[PDB]
Amino acid sequence: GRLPACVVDCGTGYTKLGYAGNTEPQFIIPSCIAIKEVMKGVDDLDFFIGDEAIEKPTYATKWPIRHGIVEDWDLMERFMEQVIFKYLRAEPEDHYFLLTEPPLNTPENREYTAEIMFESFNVPGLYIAVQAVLALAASWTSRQVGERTLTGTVIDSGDGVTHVIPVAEGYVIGSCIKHIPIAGRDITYFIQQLLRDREVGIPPEQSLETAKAVKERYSYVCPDLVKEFNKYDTDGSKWIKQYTGINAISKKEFSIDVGYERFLGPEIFFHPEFANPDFTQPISEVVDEVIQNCPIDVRRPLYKNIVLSGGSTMFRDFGRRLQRDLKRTVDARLKLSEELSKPKPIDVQVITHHMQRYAVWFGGSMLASTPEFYQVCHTKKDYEEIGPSICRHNPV
Amino acid sequence: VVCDNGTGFVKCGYAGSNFPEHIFPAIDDMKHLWDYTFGPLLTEPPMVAIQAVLTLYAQGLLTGVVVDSGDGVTHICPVYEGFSLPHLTRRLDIAGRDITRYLIKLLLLRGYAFNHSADFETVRMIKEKLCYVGYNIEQEQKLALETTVLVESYTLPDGRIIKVGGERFEAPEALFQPHLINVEGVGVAELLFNTIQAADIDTRSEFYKHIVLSGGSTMYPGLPSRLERELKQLYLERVLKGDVEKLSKFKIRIEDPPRRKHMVFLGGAVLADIMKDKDNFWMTRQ
Amino acid sequence: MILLEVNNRIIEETLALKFENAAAGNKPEAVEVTFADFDGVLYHISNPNGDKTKVMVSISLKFYKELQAHGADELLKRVYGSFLVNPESGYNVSLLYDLENLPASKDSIVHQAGMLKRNCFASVFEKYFQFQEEGKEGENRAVIHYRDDETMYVESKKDRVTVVFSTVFKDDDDVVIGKVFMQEFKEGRRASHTAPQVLFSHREPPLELKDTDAAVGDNIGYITFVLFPRHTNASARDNTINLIHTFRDYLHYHIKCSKAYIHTRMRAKTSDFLKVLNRARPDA
Amino acid sequence: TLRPYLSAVRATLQAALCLENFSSQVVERHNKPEVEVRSSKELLLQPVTISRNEKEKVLIEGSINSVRVSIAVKQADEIEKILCHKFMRFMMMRAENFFILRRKPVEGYDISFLITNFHTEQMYKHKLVDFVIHFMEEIDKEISEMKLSVNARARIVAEEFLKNF
Amino acid sequence: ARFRKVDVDEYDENKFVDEEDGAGPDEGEVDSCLRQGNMTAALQAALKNPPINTKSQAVKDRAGSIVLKVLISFKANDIEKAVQSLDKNGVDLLMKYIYKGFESPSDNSSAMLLQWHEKALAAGGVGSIVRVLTARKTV
Ligand SMILES: Nc1ncnc2c1ncn2[C@@H]1O[C@H](COP(=O)(O)OP(=O)(O)OP(=O)(O)O)[C@@H](O)[C@H]1O
Ligand SMILES: Nc1ncnc2c1ncn2[C@@H]1O[C@H](COP(=O)(O)OP(=O)(O)OP(=O)(O)O)[C@@H](O)[C@H]1O
């Protein structure tokens, strides 16, 4: 009751954690646990997570959630232990828990998660939500929407693999989900290579570090490559930037020039030949193709409500460029149509909002702040009396 | 050639044949069907030869009760001798598509990413192999939760393997309950009992020993046996009046022919001797 | 961590981050965080009247009348002097930090802001330690219902201070595990002879409290902590209270971690069974 | 006496694991484990029990196409009782993977197996027998190790807290 | 539903019915042998005229007691010889009584019974156990 239910969003790279009712998460922490090299014991108790677990290099970093799937269940379980007792500081019997999950997890994996939550932490209530549905719900706070709907298309890009998922009435249409290989990490590697070949005086073993910062501080989407290149080659004084970091080795300052990578980094989706050599096919056609694979009768609302999720979507004007390109693809198809040829083509929107970074966590907090959440949770008593049917399935 | 038009399936073939040379639903529109059927006598259901006579004909019978369940509707047509009895015959709304659709929802709740449109045919087959009604719920649920053998594996077209257990019996059941259906029936068994009982009192026993099944919806495994068990309980419950003895005496027999899937067609085909000129008969061809 | 934190980590990271952003010279962003702690304690961190340059920390507690009856006011006023403002509506205590007037040592205020719950409990202990050191015996025992179904008893004796916890274990199997933990606690002097003595009675109160309305039942456990002069004397105090007020949560933490460990071991063995079976399953 | 008992259980399993494919006599086109449904008495064999003492025993129920095996596991004290209950439940939750396990034990036993002709066709029946014996031996050893584990961790936990005063 | 509560199958004429009809070994005789330390002789007498045909469990439970009484009175090293004195039929019957015994453990009764099982198995093979399983008329 009286307290706000704990909201834990375990992502491929970053875990968002906090208490319901809050606008932003209380923690955003790296989703890997640094471990030693069973070890009963004193070896046990010993762990690090976040920043600490990262920080030593030597001592091996694992991905407690990679691709939205728990890497080892034992290590994932230990992760949840410290998530609860060290950071959230919640007495677990007094708080309902909301956890999140990516699409395509099997019911067996859901039972393993619930088994851990109920038989180890004795929680009073648990709900396991699919990331996309709460993220869509999270978008209802945006001014661009006026009526609540739970039908829409979610572009979920993480740090491992981006998924394009059309969802209708709260259930993922599993047969139409598509995966695209490429993510934050690919952007880091290519830009890293790009700096190596152009800028000099950058010590190799701290190349990624620097790389992440440049992307975080200077990347953007440009509207046209050649005009922009000409821009840099013309008004270099107010377009070329300088970045200065400190060498983790020798404690000295290195200054690098920041140029073309600014617009070339986020550009890569758009022309998929960029990102991998294998990707012939651009993002506008894949999203259109995905929508086109679902029933024709339901292809009205899906075009009107494309929502973004994950940090990979926080690059200025991403949605605008996507909206334009999609309008071009749709218009071209209906152009072909007309010529061959009626009903008017539906308007196409992409919803943007201020909480796009961790839309998932926000959605969790908003739903978990309502009485209905308390209604739909599975109680420990029902787990004991019914068993394993209950926790797999959503609330009646 | 014999053409048997059904709401969800059209069986066309020749005479003194076996099975339809073609089973394909027709795409004004009825006249359009001629273009893809005839091109590269007539059979009419109880709105020339009443299918009840037909189904029975192929069985070498003239009297009896025909239970025909297809895609769109299910009928219980009692036939006396050569003719049918347009008055006794009753209709069941109860359904194929709905069950297939319900099985999809149930599998979805289990956690399988099925789509109602894209995967309709696939799940229809899972229903066509694993999934139908059971004698009781509490016992069935126990079998589903306690043995592995509910729990049958089924290979989807993409190679993935899923599991189907309690949903095998869970989908018929909506339809039974008054709860969810929001309509009051019977079924089919109780519907069969009433039809025969509301009939005479002489050839009533005659009907009971000649109940014949027809249509694809009567091919789900165990149907004949379920019908019998339900009729014995209903007979026991009403006419028998709980007398252990009046049970031994009763005669019961549900004819469930191997080729009952297209029993109407099979009938119809060998009915049909050839008239020398086709040419002269009709008003039109006239 | 492992030892429970006096320090609220969410409060410490949030305020440290805010002071560092202030010190860097960035404009402050709004913060509004509502969260809890053990024993029905509720915190709120916000910007009063929407002014992002002011940060208010408010605490709301159920305890409070009982602790107020035992000296709380003097200690809180002694510690927080000036930071302290009129309590926000809906809460019992509010602290206000002006980002435009921060002190030279920010870590010390981060630490003290963490202390907050501990400093709320401290006065009752300090009061009875003074009583004990002065020999004022026969004083009525303090009874603090820190949780809806948990009770705390504090008693001063001639040569010792006893601290009794009446705790409830709602899920049956933790009682069985707990008896093992309390048995190990009973033998703790075999490793630390200068350690505070601990007793435990299951489903029945200690005789000294038998004359009250103490709970009896299958899920109740009584723990007594015997504190000698070495834990009640002047240096001793702060460390003692820091450990004694987190003890209950420490116990619940280790019970849960033991069950978790058993699950991991068990998981490993089931994986091994599946491997044997597949070895057993015919190759073809 | 642990060795002898297992000898008697093993021989009984050898006798009971003589199964064949049996199509249902009761339901058209059904195939069901006869020991579970029990709709044809003539297809059921005489249930037999082997006991080592008042507490440890194995119940073996045969039929033409299936055998149900139930084991009462050694549980000397409370912690062994809870460890055993948790471990059997853990395995039972995973019955789909551990495909010869019943999801619930026969009343009066801690764990039950259901072995059908489909198992004896795809696995060497003599290795199925070896497996049950192996299982009986290993669950006992694991329960003992679990017990030592909890006790060992409890000592370090009491010591770590107490030494810090 | 009600009409579904009745198990009509119990009156199905097509079912299967066992062939049934309508005392045990001599108690006094077994006691005589035992009293005289004649164990093998007691074993052979206890195995006589088993109530394979009675309906009441009282008479069956009686013979099982007598047989069990004898098996318990035996010395470990003398089991093999007694077992080897029996014919195949005796060995099969002994195996039936042994399994019977497994159902009434008390003290170390199962401990010696496991010894009997071992020796009986050595003599009659797994086939003797098979015949415990499919007996329709048993001890
Ligand atoms: N404004 C921004 N500009 C550029 N990158 C950003 C911005 N905001 C966030 N990001 C990036 O997003 C990344 C984190 O992405 P995300 O949160 O989607 O991963 P995740 O949550 O672990 O994945 P998932 O939860 O989908 O498994 C960070 O590495 C960061 O670079
Ligand atoms: N082998 C089978 N077992 C169970 N059900 C089946 C089988 N084959 C088909 N069905 C079901 O039967 C239904 C259709 O039956 P069928 O095609 O024989 O009748 P129909 O000709 O379509 O209908 P009607 O003639 O009554 O208008 C389908 O919905 C399908 O689910």
Author numbering:
A (entry chain A): 3 to 39, 51 to 354, 359 to 413
B (entry chain B): 9 to 35, 83 to 95, 108 to 114, 138 to 376
C (entry chain D): 1 to 284
D (entry chain F): 4 to 168
E (entry chain G): 9 to 30, 35 to 151
Q: Which statements did the authors publish about this structure?
A:
The Arp2/3 complex regulates many cellular processes by stimulating formation of branched actin filament networks. The Arp2/3 complex is evolutionarily conserved and built from two actin related proteins (Arp2 and Arp3) and five other protein subunits (ARPC1-5). When activated by a nucleation-promoting factor such as WAVE or WASP, the Arp2/3 complex is unique in its ability to assemble branched actin networks by stimulating new filament growth from the side of existing actin filaments. However, in mammals, Arp3, ARPC1 and ARPC5 are present as two isoforms – Arp3, Arp3B, ARPC1A, ARPC1B, ARPC5 and ARPC5L – that share 91, 67 and 67% sequence identity, respectively.
